[PDB]
């Protein structure tokens, strides 16, 4: 909408107060004009029609329980925009400052969140498996990263290419979580998953097997569920990324860690310069080796560590 840029204040899903960029024209809207062509947050009103209504508020204060998922969807989309711009010189998900749209209160008791090819969509959860999913910065950044993938490698969402697609989203979701630097970890979704259970998460990148996911290519799933295991076999790539960054010994193979920043540079270059819609795990290894070679040199520790990490998870 046309209006003047304003700054509201509210509370997110976890009860934390934050400022949000709004737009004033009769109402105060969740429309942040400070980033690209805008960040716009919508109310789906417990229905499944999308996007719903641009979020309107009478007083620029967002402290109601109903407001909390919208506050966090809007704010964390801003953090994710800032990460891609400041760290990777990428302007929004298309590289041309495309408007970022999100809808909250999708359906009733909906235990998921997703990028749909056009926008972000967040369920509220049923209060037992999930609380409103926009409360997790890694969740927001994971799903926005699918938009980056759509405009770059275009990894088809099935089998090995789909597991790479998922892992790329977990990797950058985690790197955005570290960028914001509030309780960062190598787990996925811990801030919104199972409010009654402490210390768990949806997936672990440091130890995928904690939640039944494979940490070695010899344990890959080859059935048809989950689009051929895209959220299962992602553990193999997530573990390799964790090893590249943090180092460790895994199935007797030692990896020299190179840190999160270099992990992000290597995988961002692989995603935007080398991966294709049909890339498999072996081709990801080659893309990561080439990306590290471009950035650090063929004789570098960075290249050696990429090879060690893929060796450790059984991907040649």
């Amino acid at each position: 909408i046309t209006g003047t840029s304003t700054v509201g204040v509210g509370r997110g899903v976890l009860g934390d107060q934050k400022n949000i960029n709004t737009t004033y024209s009769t109402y105060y809207y969740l429309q942040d004009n400070t980033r690209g062509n805008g960040i716009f947050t919508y109310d789906a009103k417990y229905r499944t029609t999308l996007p719903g209504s641009l979020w309107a508020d009478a007083d620029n204060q967002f402290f109601a329980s109903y407001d909390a998922p919208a506050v966090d969807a809007h704010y964390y989309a801003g953090v994710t925009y800032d990460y891609y711009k400041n760290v990777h010189n990428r302007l929004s998900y298309d590289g041309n400052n495309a408007a970022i749209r999100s809808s909250v209160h999708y359906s009733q008791g909906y235990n998921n969140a997703f990028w749909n090819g056009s926008q972000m969509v967040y369920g509220d959860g049923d209060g037992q498996t999930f609380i409103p999913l926009s409360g997790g910065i890694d969740v927001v950044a994971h799903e926005l990263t699918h938009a980056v993938t759509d405009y770059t490698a275009g990894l088809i969402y099935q089998n090995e290419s789909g597991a790479i697609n998922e892992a790329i989203s977990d990797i950058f979701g985690t790197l955005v979580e570290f960028y914001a630097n509030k309780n960062p970890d190598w787990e996925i979704g811990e801030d919104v998953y199972t409010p009654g259970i402490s210390g768990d998460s949806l997936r672990s990148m440091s130890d995928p097997a904690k939640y039944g996911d494979p940490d070695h290519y010899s344990k890959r799933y080859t059935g048809t569920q989950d689009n051929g295991g895209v959220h299962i076999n992602s553990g193999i790539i997530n573990k390799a990324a964790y090893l590249i960054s943090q180092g460790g010994t895994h199935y007797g193979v030692s990896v020299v860690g190179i840190g999160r920043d270099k992990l992000g540079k290597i995988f961002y270059r692989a995603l935007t310069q080398y991966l294709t819609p049909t890339s498999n795990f072996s081709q990801l290894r080659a893309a990561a080796v080439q990306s590290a070679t471009d950035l650090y040199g063929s004789t570098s520790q960075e290249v050696a560590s990429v090879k060690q990490a893929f060796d450790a998870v059984g991907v040649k």
Binding site: F114, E143, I188, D226, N227, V230
Partner: peptide, 5 residues
């Protein structure tokens, strides 16, 4: 369906 299957 995307954060989880």
């Amino acid at each position: 369906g995307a954060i989880i299957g």
